[PDB]
Design a protein around this ligand. Structure first.
Ligand SMILES: Nc1ncnc2c1ncn2[C@@H]1O[C@H](COP(=O)(O)OP(=O)(O)OP(=O)(O)O)[C@@H](O)[C@H]1O
Ligand SMILES: Nc1ncnc2c1ncn2[C@@H]1O[C@H](COP(=O)(O)OP(=O)(O)O)[C@@H](O)[C@H]1O
Ligand SMILES: Nc1ncnc2c1ncn2[C@@H]1O[C@H](COP(=O)(O)OP(=O)(O)O)[C@@H](O)[C@H]1O
Ligand SMILES: [Zn+2]
Lengths: 370, 370, 379, 120
């Protein structure tokens, strides 16, 4: 009996260890109302969380507590974890030990303060923080190979060979789902359809998930988009109003492969995956090309795998065979790994206990992280 | 054609026209179409069903005001064509549009359909030699005569902050919010009804804009002025009747700096300025704080510069020099910039010829913009 | 605790009674009969001196708490229903009267629109309030009034009473009873508001959209030869006993049209819902449209709810509202109490909640200390 | 529920323990919301081409005296019970008592404590 709780910037995936898929999946947001001095009606919650805030988007200002895999407002994150254990999962945190997930190369204060809350506020019996990328490999039953776990908050590239990780080869890029969502708003505003508010940004994320797809040749796709209106698809908003996004459909996910569009002055998700493999030892490169995994929900874009293969193959040597690993459950790839890890009898020892936390302090986490 | 170019500012509230030779705009009239309020069947009433600028101001109470441009976007194009036709009337300028070339001043990050249709009208309806769409912010710097400078241009329709350093505008650091002078006029009408004076009519909305422009001071501390008993300064209406404005005077334009009070999800005028600087690169931040320029009519509020300086200082880093350099001609700054730009021999290269638009296509106007 | 009293001070009529009741106990014209004055002065009057307003409200609240209701004012709480954007000095005076003179325990200044929503039970709904002075609309989404997307036009009782008086004076046909069997025009210079109100209620009705649209173009006479529908029969109304006013059939179905007339601006009682709904947040559109509420005594007029809902669906197809509000299903809520006494019923339902009332409501001990009533304006 | 939430929140502020978890934290009544009609009943075609008798329809004054279901027709309008009247007793700000009336004010003109400016 143990709890796996993925603390993703976009969506918080929580559930019991051993189960196939996560029990409760809700958007990680806190909804505070745009209140005036006028008195409010009955059935009023001071701050709404998750699926409740997703229902009452109209009035509530949606504030994401985790920004680029860094917890900015801890009071907000506490209210999400309270919604996770007590309401969503229907379980006491004192009974079950809780596994959390942190992105690699995050600030040290993040892991420090995270565990402090779990030990003091919720009074958990044991707490282990893990790297999202390390878990994602277990999903595919692969010990060897690199992963390109692109989330809503961040995208990170962690090469692991024969159950041994290369820490110095790890590269983090701040370009992620929320930056693409923010980019899609700007180009939709250029077409005509203006989306400004926090509630409207959530509707633009629903537009992104459904329509947007990765093009094989961007320049070739822009030529077809100009000539014919075949790529132009219609989407119905919450309001009866319908919109035809056009070429901006495949223009949004292009930003992943060339950040110049967003204006970050950084390497693309294809180029960073190559650079990470080159930073590793020369011998093991072979297996990393052969076992390139794509994880998170930012790798569920239709035809990212085809475009990824093409771009890596061009950069990589001709003799090498480049196979991209795209399992059907990419969105729940971080959690399903956690469920496999927590269930294993070996992992029982690796848990950090309250007694261990009390004596040493919150600094113990940095030793027993990975 | 060598004959003098005609600058025209597309201000949502007030459109400012004139020749490039003039130091100031000779002809500047309100941007609204005036039709008779009662649907005219009979003779001896207001004939034509069109009253623009000074003719409208004379017979204002009889007519019904309808603004053609909202939030820096043209809603009714038929109305805007009549307005631009009145610019080339016997009343203002008194010239052929076919002879003189034109310069438009569209707000930043507007819809591309707005720019394309604006060009189509000025090339097809009027037989213009050449047209050039420009950004309102870039012009404001030419007027003042400095290359580096952030331009907080608070218009009637839209308030936007564009950072430009050494003649280089960062397009990602641009910030645009719809809460502008027109919204302040709308919110003042609500507070005037809370004082007990209704301005229900579209004509009666114009005198609320006059009340705002005459008497509305921005308090340095809003909470202290609320507790203090007001003088209740009397304003005289067109009919002759007096109205005591009282606390509505100062707590109306406050909604610029704090738009959450009414319940509008926006950043605020102090916030968009700071955010635009913070979004730009770290090296430039100090110079961009050291060079801020106020543009448009919604900066002329009494004690605006006093409040903004205080509200920017607390958000901005400690011990940083913040100079908010307002010109004396803030309202007419955007046009004077265009008048200088138009006069230069470089402008001859920048504009798009009528034959160029026929051959090249639609993109011609967009690609030459920058 | 005792059952808290509910008062709702309006320009035409005031609703009064006790909390946890099916409807209001007393509903009476908001006036007071002062010695010397032949016509009784109106108790609520905006933009006058505070001392003169204080005396009128002191006189009125006294009549409500003794002649109409029979209960001690100091003993039990108050739930003062007043519309949003009610003038500052008036609301400040009304509280100051209750707290100083009567010495009430605590007053709760509820907005009429949010109270009307409670009566149905639905958490989110659009609320139109066609009153005496102004016909106001205010979208309420899940307990939060959206002041950003407010709407008001002077197309209520006062604007309708004035329109009736004007039309009657043009086609004036009275039988005085002094060789006045023949049509006698404007024997009386002005008609008293009490008579005009009784004519409006009994004689005048709201026409169908199809017939109404013809009536609009008919009286305009826009290059057409007698293109009006057949009016109802002329009704004879007694004035001050002997004088019998013959009301023309045209006046009955034309007087109402001033509310639903476009008048170039595109500003009717119908348009005000769609003007507000278009300005609302994009997520809230479909929920508010589906849950419409029509309160106010002006909407009691026979066949108003059918004309409004029809006029809405016609103005939807108009090119301005066709893009945003094109494919929307507008459905009206039928509140439990009558259209006049929806506002009051909410305050009573709220007054029955003793636990929440005491907390939200402003106590006298707080007012005596501070002297600052909380409002939707800045503090 | 709001009272318990407000009480729990207030005693936590009064305690000033910074929401210290000593113990474990955390039947329903559901009303159905009123159904919205697609089309409200139109004005009956009788109102068009029918003489209106002012005797049959009721005036505002007599309409509003029966507020619970104020009926347009006279045949619907039922007679309401007679309104009870009040016996006033005066008490001052500084002074306590002043004047009052007996327990049998019905058919009596006697004051329990007679006090008036003309009587001093
Ligand atoms: N099918 C999809 N196609 C395209 N984009 C998607 C799709 N599903 C989700 N997204 C986008 O990618 C993000 C994926 O977030 P996800 O559910 O993987 O959680 P997360 O916060 O990224 O967690 P983690 O960092 O642990 O992977 C969403 O926020 C959304 O913006
Ligand atoms: N002296 C003034 N004081 C206060 N507000 C003013 C003053 N003059 C103009 N305004 C406001 O600013 C608006 C003018 O905006 P303007 O500068 O013409 O915009 P744009 O830059 O788009 O042309 C007016 O409609 C009014 O709301
Ligand atoms: N039962 C009714 N039938 C028809 N018209 C009514 C009825 N009751 C009131 N009215 C009319 O509608 C108006 C309603 O005003 P009301 O809502 O009571 O006032 P306020 O808006 O000041 O609160 C009255 O002035 C009257 O002219
Ligand atoms: Zn005394």
């Amino acid at each position: 009996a143990a709890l796996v709780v993925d603390n993703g910037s976009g969506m918080c995936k929580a559930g019991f260890a051993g189960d196939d898929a996560p029990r409760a999946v809700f958007p990680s947001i806190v909804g505070r109302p745009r209140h005036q001095g006028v008195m409010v009606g009955m059935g009023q919650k001071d701050s709404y969380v998750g699926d409740e805030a997703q229902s009452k988007r109209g009035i509530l200002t949606l504030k994401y507590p985790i920004e680029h895999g860094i917890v900015t407002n801890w009071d907000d994150m506490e209210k999400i974890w309270h919604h996770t254990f007590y309401n969503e999962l229907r379980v006491a945190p004192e009974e079950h030990p809780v596994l959390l997930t942190e992105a690699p190369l995050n600030p040290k204060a993040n892991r420090e303060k995270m565990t402090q809350i779990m030990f003091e506020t919720f009074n958990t019996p044991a707490m282990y923080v893990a790297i999202q990328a390390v878990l994602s490999l277990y999903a595919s039953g692969r010990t060897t190979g690199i992963v390109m776990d692109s989330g809503d908050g961040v995208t990170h590239t962690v090469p692991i060979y024969e159950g041994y990780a290369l820490p110095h080869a790890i590269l983090r890029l701040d370009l992620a789902g929320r930056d693409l969502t923010d980019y899609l708003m700007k180009i939709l505003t250029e077409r005509g359809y203006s989306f400004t508010t926090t509630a409207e940004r959530e509707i633009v994320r629903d537009i992104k998930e459904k329509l947007c797809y990765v093009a094989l040749d961007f320049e070739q796709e822009m030529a077809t988009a100009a000539s014919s209106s075949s790529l132009e698809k219609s989407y119905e908003l919450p309001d009866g109003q319908v919109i035809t996004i056009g070429n901006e459909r495949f223009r949004c996910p292009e930003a992943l492969f060339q950040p110049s569009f967003l204006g970050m002055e950084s390497c693309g998700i294809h180029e960073t995956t190559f650079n990470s493999i080159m930073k590793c030892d020369v011998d093991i490169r072979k297996d990393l090309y052969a076992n390139t995994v794509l994880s998170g929900g930012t790798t569920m874009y239709p035809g990212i795998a085809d475009r990824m293969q093409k771009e890596i193959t061009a950069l990589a040597p001709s003799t090498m065979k480049i196979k991209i690993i795209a399992p059907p459950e990419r969105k729940y790839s971080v959690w399903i790994g956690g469920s496999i890890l927590a269930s294993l009898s070996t992992f029982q020892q690796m848990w950090i206990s309250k007694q261990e936390y009390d004596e040493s302090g919150p600094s113990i986490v940095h030793r027993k992280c990975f | 054609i060598a004959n003098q170019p005609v600058v025209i500012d597309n201000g949502s509230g007030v459109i400012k026209a004139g020749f490039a030779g003039d130091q100031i705009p000779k002809y500047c009239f309100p941007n609204y179409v005036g039709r008779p309020k009662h649907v005219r069947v009979m003779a001896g009433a207001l004939e034509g069903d069109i009253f623009i600028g000074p003719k409208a101001e004379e017979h204002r109470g009889l007519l019904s005001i309808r603004y053609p441009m909202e939030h820096g976007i043209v809603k009714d194009w038929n109305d805007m064509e009549r307005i631009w036709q009145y610019v080339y009337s016997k009343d203002q300028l008194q010239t052929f549009s076919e002879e003189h070339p034109v310069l438009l001043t569209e707000a930043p990050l507007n819809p591309r359909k707005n720019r394309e249709r604006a060009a189509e009208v000025f090339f097809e309806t009027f037989n213009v030699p050449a047209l050039f769409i420009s950004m309102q912010a870039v012009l404001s710097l030419y007027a003042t005569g400095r290359t580096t400078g952030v331009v907080l241009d608070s218009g009637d329709g839209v308030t936007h902050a564009v950072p430009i350093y050494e003649g280089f505008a960062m397009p990602h650091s641009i910030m645009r919010i719809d809460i502008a002078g027109r919204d302040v006029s709308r919110f003042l009408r609500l507070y005037l009804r809370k004082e007990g004076y209704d301005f229900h009519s579209s004509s009666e909305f114009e005198i609320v804009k006059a009340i705002k422009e005459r008497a509305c001071y921005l308090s340095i501390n809003p909470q202290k002025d609320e507790t203090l008993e007001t003088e209740k300064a009397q304003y005289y209406l067109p009919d002759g009747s007096t109205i005591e404005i009282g606390p509505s005077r100062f707590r109306a334009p406050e909604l610029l700096f704090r738009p959450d009070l009414i319940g509008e999800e926006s950043e605020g005028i102090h916030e968009v300025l700071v955010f635009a600087i913070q979004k730009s690169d770290m090296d430039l931040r100090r110079t961009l704080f050291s060079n801020i320029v106020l543009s448009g009519g919604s900066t002329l509020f009494k004690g605006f510069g006093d409040r903004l300086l205080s509200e920017v200082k607390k958000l901005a880093p400690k011990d940083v020099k913040i100079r908010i350099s307002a010109p004396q001609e803030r309202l007419y700054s955007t046009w004077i910039g265009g008048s200088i730009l138009a006069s230069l021999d470089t402008f001859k290269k920048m504009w798009v010829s009528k034959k160029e638009y026929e051959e090249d296509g639609a993109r011609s106007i967009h690609r030459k913009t920058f | 605790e005792k059952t808290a009293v509910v008062i709702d001070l309006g320009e035409a009529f005031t609703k009064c009674g006790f909390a946890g009741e099916t409807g209001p106990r007393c509903i009476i014209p908001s006036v007071i009969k002062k010695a010397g004055m032949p016509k009784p002065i109106k108790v609520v009057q905006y933009n006058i001196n505070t001392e003169e307003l204080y005396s009128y409200l002191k006189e009125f609240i006294h009549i409500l708490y003794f002649r109409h209701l029979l209960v001690n004012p100091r003993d039990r709480r108050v739930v003062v229903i007043e519309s949003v954007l009610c003038p500052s000095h008036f609301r400040e005076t009304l509280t100051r009267v209750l707290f100083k003179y009567f010495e009430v325990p605590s007053v709760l200044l509820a907005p009429s629109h949010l109270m009307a929503l409670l009566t149905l039970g639905i958490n989110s709904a659009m609320v139109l309030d066609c009153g005496y002075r102004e016909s106001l609309v205010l979208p309420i989404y899940e307990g939060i009034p959206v002041l950003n997307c407010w709407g008001a036009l002077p197309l209520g009782g006062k604007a309708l009473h004035k329109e009736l008086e004007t039309q009657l004076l043009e086609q004036c046909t009275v039988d005085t009873g002094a060789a006045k069997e023949q049509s006698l025009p404007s024997v009386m210079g002005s008609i008293p508001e009490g008579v005009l109100e009784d004519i409006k209620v009994r004689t005048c009705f709201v026409s169908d959209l199809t017939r109404g649209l013809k009536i609009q173009a008919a009286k305009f006479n826009i290059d057409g030869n007698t293109e009006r529908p057949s009016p109802p029969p002329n009704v004879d109304y007694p004035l001050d006993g002997e004088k019998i006013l013959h009301v023309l059939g045209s006046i009955r179905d034309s007087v109402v049209e001033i509310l639903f007339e476009q008048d170039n601006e595109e500003k009717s009682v119908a348009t005000l819902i769609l003007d507000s709904l278009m300005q609302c947040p994009i997520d809230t559109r479909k929920q508010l449209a589906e849950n419409l509420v029509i309160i106010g005594g002006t909407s009691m007029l026979p066949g108003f709810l059918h004309r409004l809902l029809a006029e809405i669906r016609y103005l939807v197809e108009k090119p301005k509202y066709k893009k945003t509000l094109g494919t929307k299903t507008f459905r009206i809520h039928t509140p439990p109490a009558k259209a006049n006494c929806v506002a009051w019923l909410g305050g009573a339902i709220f007054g029955a909640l003793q636990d929440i009332l005491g907390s939200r409501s402003v106590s006298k001990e707080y007012y005596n200390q501070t002297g600052r009533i909380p409002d939707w304006c800045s503090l | 529920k709001e009272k318990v939430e407000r009480d729990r929140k207030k005693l936590a502020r009064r305690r000033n323990y910074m929401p210290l978890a000593f113990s474990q934290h955390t039947k329903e009544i559901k009303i159905e919301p009123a159904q919205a009609v697609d089309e409200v009943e139109p004005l009956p075609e009788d109102y068009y081409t029918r003489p209106v008798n002012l005797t049959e329809v009721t005036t505002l004054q007599q309409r509003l005296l029966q507020p619970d279901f104020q009926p347009i027709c006279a045949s619907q309008l039922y007679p309401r019970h007679k309104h009870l009247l009040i016996k006033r007793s005066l008490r001052c700000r500084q002074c306590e008592h002043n004047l009052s009336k007996p327990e049998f004010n019905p058919t009596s003109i006697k004051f329990k404590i007679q006090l008036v400016a003309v009587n001093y």
